[PDB]
């Protein structure tokens, strides 16, 4: 321990998390006090416990790889990212195995084809940090050893996962260009964004669905096609928006083109006319021309082989959903509801979908009950009627979304042997709002599973591979999130208790919430009940604490539509609509659990390439560095731990018999002619990075 005078250390600070302090007097070993001199000139005696993190030299700060730091601690990482980002305007930085990517919130001219080819053929460390380098390394490893790869981006909402994923795919399309199948696989993104992304208060272009795109390659490592897997689309988005949030983009693209002659038969108007698009109070995104976006969407559909007739059919479905949302449901007393058959919006809804308005009006306000002994028809209250109507709207959109993805996959098919593939994962990031519900619970659960997949490959596997070789290895501590995962997915867990309540015909949100209280309050450290609420619960996620409201958990987990309404659309004279509701028990939560299990396995059977995205500020400001919010994300992603294990990891390994050519004691002797840059195991030798390539020369 030598904290000599004149050098600097980091101490806690409220605003900037950490602050530098110069050691005024030299350090006497064992002393509890430290003579420091603050930046303001205020002297102090810091109560240390033999201690403060040492600040790295100004020569080592700002480097491309943070493993090159002398003192690996949180202040160093935070400080290095700050000056690289805030001052040097560098958004990419290497943190060992992972790439770190800071959201610039500004268009940077660093993705041109010239730069793409500049990265091609190069090694990982040869060039400055860039998403292209991560992609190149995956493409490089796919070719040299015929292994499937995965580009796995992560981070909270608005951190820049989708932008990273698309640029990674842009790289593959450029270097591995063969038919221009490359332009089609790239086109799959903007299509799914139009029908799958929506403005939230976290991100103007938030992904409300998860995607995993497998890019297939032939023996020449040229792209031959691709396949897209989607995960739980947000259905409530179709019929509900919070303040300053929008429905899916395509609804507004469609309304913005309502007066075009081609669309006039859809009887549309401004987005402010329709209840399903107006609810947020703002129908426009700053710096987005929805009409111009409609044009690009049409061009993109055409590029994928979807002509005018195909586009008008999906636009017809979309317009129908909007009109459905404006069907007037009046109250008849306090126990009954009513819809006029001559309701204007109902009539076009039925015309576009070839339905009979009488049957729709009837079964929006009544529910049939078959007991195989009698058939009871009970009226619905106005709230129940609106609910049944909205549920129908959400169902139509869900089928339409699946229909589009299914057709996209058909367009990207290939009649050939898949040599290898590179999967690009891009799911909705960790998010939390004032009011969190089932939607947020699922997204955060998904993110929890990704962190598990990450920790397993980076910390569990890598260290276990070293430990069982009998080599000296100080284990790196990392936050294992298996407990919170078990709390959610395992038996007697939250999602299991929810399914049980859903099986009860008299099941309710309140009773389910009570079963969570009894089972987990003062029983599971990760589960908490707020003192000033008996309608919610808070979970300690890896990223942050998140309070969830229990309202609507059963309904959303069931995700049902009344039988009579389904039959009406099943008898649709519109071929596309009839296809959606043709006849061909498990809950949303159970399906979501199972889907994610398959995904994790698919990722584990590939060589992962991780990218950690980070939102620097909450105001979408260009190159603004919010220390508190950033350090929170660095802790959640375990960046500091990742850098540490990356630093002390031995990249190159040799078996003893292999070592002789260039026995156990003979090799150890010749190696000495420092002692830290290699270690000897049971059947293997290991070396430090680049500490051998100089022998090759
Ligand atoms: N590299 C970047 N360059 C410019 N803008 C970016 C970049 N990354 C993110 N952004 C901005 O952040 C917004 C949201 O990014 P996105 O990738 O959708 O985040 P996520 O998918 O993680 O929610 C984008 O619409 C874009 O304006
Ligand atoms: O806002 V993002 O859902 O695309 O993480
Ligand atoms: Mg996204």
Residue numbers in the entry: 5 to 54, 57 to 184, 188 to 593, 621 to 698, 713 to 723, 727 to 750
What did the article's authors report about this structure?
Class X myosin has been found to be localized at the tips of filopodia, which are plasma membrane protrusions containing bundled actin that are necessary for cellular processes such as cell adhesion, migration, angiogenesis and the formation of cell–cell contacts. Myosin X is required for filopodia formation and extension. Myosin motors move along actin filaments via a series of conformational changes in the motor domain that are coupled with the sequential release of MgATP hydrolysis products, Pi and MgADP. These conformational changes in the motor domain are amplified by the myosin lever arm, which is comprized of the C-terminal subdomain of the motor domain (known as the converter) and an extended alpha helix length that varies with the myosin class12.
In contrast to myosin X, lack of interaction allows the myosin Vc converter to explore slightly different orientations. Comparison of these PPS structures show that while the subdomains of the motor are totally conserved in position among the myosin PPS structures obtained to date, the myosin X converter is rotated compared with that of myosin Vc and other myosins.
